[PDB]
Design a protein around this ligand. Structure first.
Ligand SMILES: [Cl-]
Ligand SMILES: [Cl-]
Ligand SMILES: [Mg+2]
Ligand SMILES: [Mg+2]
Ligand code: NA
Ligand code: NA
Ligand code: NA
Ligand code: NA
Ligand code: NA
Ligand code: NA
Ligand SMILES: [Zn+2]
Ligand SMILES: [Zn+2]
Lengths: 476, 67, 475, 67
């Protein structure tokens, strides 16, 4: 499984596989890079990454829709470009169990991201072809970005160093705005720093190995380092990291195109947004943190890996399809081996379908309870459907069967008020706070009484052989 | 020149196009709204702002006490 | 393409490669069922299988006639590869031709009158009866169009109703019919049983696929299904003939077999169990018995039966559109805001409705109408309502509407002690289920909504950029 | 002369009595309140209006989008 050390190796593979097209003509950035991203995802299947070679005002280039298709998703894992969805899901399920794969620290001279340094008058526009993603966005945004922060209380604990993806609004030549949502790991570290009026060191990386971008958006535990997961997804091959210039305890990928070293200004909020998000709607403007860019390191001829998001199943929905379902499945399975599979591809896990064996009566509700007490599912998952072991949670047709034949709304549907919510969900009336709904679409198991018959029909005797005899007769 | 989102005149140039005279970028500094000199923006009446709405905007995440 | 009998349709199915012949002799018990299950298991382009020789019987059988979208399209005279939504829109059009009076023909002109059986009656002589599922209570006649007339108004042709009911063979000349309480036949049976008088009945087998289609369609009581057949044939009236023993009773002229008899009044016997469409066995109950008084049939009759079981068997294809179309029309008559209705899943127990929201809470009103319709009041248990722009047939989009437009505090409503369907194995008080309505629509005034839920307009050049990308990919 | 419901001075005469000098009718034009010169109206404190209440008053029926 070909493993990539930088974004450039992956892009080269994408082109060799016919999953990358080059826009050689110059194109002004405002309406076009956004439109190309929407059109690319609108292509439906085999959507390629589009590479812009020339932008009206800027020196360097940009790439959109890098992750925006199952083909690209498969090549990211080093698999055949046409590997199926569940084939990739099972491949992630395997490599995941190699979890602790210590990264490889390299000298500064060996890191391509340290080729150029900007410490005098700082200007993001000099190196990044900033553009507007959606019309009513509050400014130019950096959507696909891996952000590195460390715990102020335990700055030496490498496990508590967390890298994740957060949207970044450019507000000046040297200052940007980050959405430190309350339920994500970065907010835990920011609270410790702001409780002492101390700044929080931060490193914003752009244009990395697709696996790094993958783990960034993955809701793993706080005490789990995402770099160690990347080595597992590379099937044991450790990834290369280097220490930040300005901050120790801060490690960034060695093959990053751009690294922004800075700090979050403490106890300060400014007008961030609005911004078109994955629910297909604009998210209103709020008072969010500001970050001061202290230094820039970047490779010569840097590449801007940004993405378009909007009416669902843009590039971001492909990115979040499997990196949300896998950790939710593993987190459930640790306590409950009866769980078969978990589907959390829909709107970033706000809707989840879980397949499980029912150990004893009511066990389905307990699985839902575990899902609703997980780092991601507690604030995100609003609708949790639980189906039997033999129902494929990825097959909505089958889920529709389980809903119609196994759900007694008197008992199987449970609605719980005033539970943790996600503000980006435009349905939550108290924003960031939604009422949960649990649906037990499993067949009753003792000691749950069941006066009715509900066991499935065993197919007639020769059905297996008759399938072949029918296929054979048809070959005429 | 005024800001298209809140109508304040406290707007200044943020940066020039790195190559040539292609375009410029302006920033509000009262509500942080930025835009390029090429794109003529028309902010929807729902997304406009005044000093009153910025006041009761809500912070994310909350600021903790100081100890 | 319009068909007058089952044989014309079978000929078309074979010309289109949607029918295969089992020329070898085959045992009736484990095989006809297995072939039916295997046929549907093929996934796509499932053909009908025609059995030429059965171990004990003289005549032949046909299974999985309706068991694929290809066969469903050929039924409507369309191209074999016509899409699902194309067929749905074609039905939406022909439906508006509703009253198309059928054509009554002389007895000599009806092929179903070619042979008559009046002496010692034996169904097994003419019908290759077989067992459908292992634990079934006996040999069943699944696909059958049953003709009954209202005893109170036996001359009103509108109150003559034809529908599909499962029939268990209990003797050479007696069978058991499932007269479910919510179906039209139960209305006529109650009138007859209230006077201890029998109810005349005619059981037809092997008909024009459109006749079988309308039988299973939940149209109103005062609407004759033969008149709908003429509408679905794009104005070509269908041919009917009067029954031998009973006036007021009309059967299709091109039927393979007609069983003329009567329901024995105020009597119930052990019917079932029987594997039904939810994929489970339905328990045995005390159901009506029918006495066969006379048989008319065509020479060399063909037994059109179907297999049903774990869902998406032949029956699930048959009921896919004949349930959604009348529900859409019934809703649309009162509420023009409705866009489309999806009731293909387990015979309408789950329904997804696409609609414009005229005013705040209108989605709940649409659900109320569906739950007060002939088929949705007893059948529909879970009703999801989505916006105008959501395709109710695209479960991916429906999942998006659920995740982004449903606030379970207000949008989910659960109502106890409403009319139910006993075949649904979830009903704890059997035949009685608690309804659930899900309002996955975007709020409209005067419903308050402090949040921003409007959808993003695509960036400017997306239309042209779609072409420029497709062209760049052609390198 | 002021309006009895909102206190604005932008009030004018609407009509004269068709027969003789019986009475006149006045209209607010800031809140649409009309009254006859004979009846001395006393608007209850519940029903009075200011520029603030008229702003967030709520419409019947809603205005649709434009297409
Ligand atoms: Cl909002
Ligand atoms: Cl039962
Ligand atoms: Mg983390
Ligand atoms: Mg009827
Ligand atoms: Na992460
Ligand atoms: Na961590
Ligand atoms: Na259940
Ligand atoms: Na009728
Ligand atoms: Na019918
Ligand atoms: Na709603
Ligand atoms: Zn402004
Ligand atoms: Zn006034």
């Amino acid at each position: 499984a070909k493993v990539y050390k930088d974004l450039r190796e992956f892009l080269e593979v994408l082109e060799q596989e016919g999953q990358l097209i080059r826009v050689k003509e110059e194109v002004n950035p405002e309406p076009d890079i956004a439109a190309a991203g929407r059109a690319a995802a609108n292509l439906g299947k085999n959507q390629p990454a589009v590479f812009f070679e020339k932008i009206k005002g800027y020196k360097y280039s940009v790439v959109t829709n890098v992750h925006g298709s199952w083909q690209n998703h498969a090549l990211m894992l080093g698999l055949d470009k046409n590997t199926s969805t569940k084939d990739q899901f099972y491949e992630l399920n395997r490599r995941w169990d190699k979890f602790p794969v210590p990264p490889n620290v390299v000298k500064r001279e060996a890191a391509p991201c340290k080729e150029n340094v900007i410490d005098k008058d700082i200007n993001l526009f000099e190196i990044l072809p900033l553009y507007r993603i959606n019309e009513q966005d509050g400014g130019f945004y950096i959507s696909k970005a891996s952000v590195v922060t460390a715990d102020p209380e335990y700055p030496d604990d490498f496990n508590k160093l967390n890298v994740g993806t957060y949207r970044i609004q450019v507000k000046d030549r040297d200052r940007v705005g980050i959405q430190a949502l309350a339920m994500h790991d970065i907010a835990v570290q920011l609270e410790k720093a702001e409780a002492e009026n101390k700044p929080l060191p931060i490193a914003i990386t752009i244009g990395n190995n697709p696996l790094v971008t993958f783990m960034a958006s993955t809701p793993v535990g706080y005490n789990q380092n995402e770099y160690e997961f990347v080595g597992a997804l590379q099937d044991g091959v450790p990834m290369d990291i280097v220490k930040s210039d300005l901050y120790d305890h801060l490690y960034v990928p060695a093959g990053s195109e751009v690294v922004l070293e800075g700090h979050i200004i403490p106890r300060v909020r400014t007008v961030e947004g609005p911004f078109g998000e994955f629910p297909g709607s604009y998210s209103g403007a709020r008072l969010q943190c500001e970050v001061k860019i202290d230094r820039i390191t970047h490779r010569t001829n840097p590449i801007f890996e940004n993405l378009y998001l909007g009416i669902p199943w843009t590039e971001i929905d492909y990115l979040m399809a499997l990196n949300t379902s896998v950790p939710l499945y593993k987190q459930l399975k640790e306590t409950m081996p009866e769980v078969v599979a978990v589907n959390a591809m829909y709107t970033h896990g706000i809707g989840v379908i879980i397949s499980t064996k029912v150990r004893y009566g009511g066990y389905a509700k307990g699985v839902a309870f575990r899902l609703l007490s997980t780092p991601h599912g507690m604030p995100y998952s609003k609708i949790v459907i639980v189906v039997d072991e033999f129902v494929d949670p990825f097959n909505l047709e089958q889920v529709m069967w389980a809903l119609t034949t196994r759900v007694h709304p008197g008992k199987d549907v449970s609605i719980i008020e005033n539970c943790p919510g996600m503000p980006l969900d435009p349905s939550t009336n108290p924003p960031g706070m939604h009422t949960k709904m649990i649906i037990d679409a499993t067949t009753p198991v003792p000691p749950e009484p069941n006066p009715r018959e509900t066991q499935l029909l065993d197919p007639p005797d020769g059905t297996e052989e008759w399938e072949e005899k029918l296929k054979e007769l048809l070959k005429n | 020149m005024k800001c298209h989102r809140c109508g304040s005149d406290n707007v200044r140039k943020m940066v020039d196009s790195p190559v040539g005279d292609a375009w410029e970028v302006y920033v509000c500094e009262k509500c942080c709204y930025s835009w390029r000199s090429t794109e003529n923006p028309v902010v929807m009446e729902k997304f406009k702002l005044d000093d009153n709405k910025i006041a009761n905007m809500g912070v994310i995440p909350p600021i903790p006490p100081l100890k």
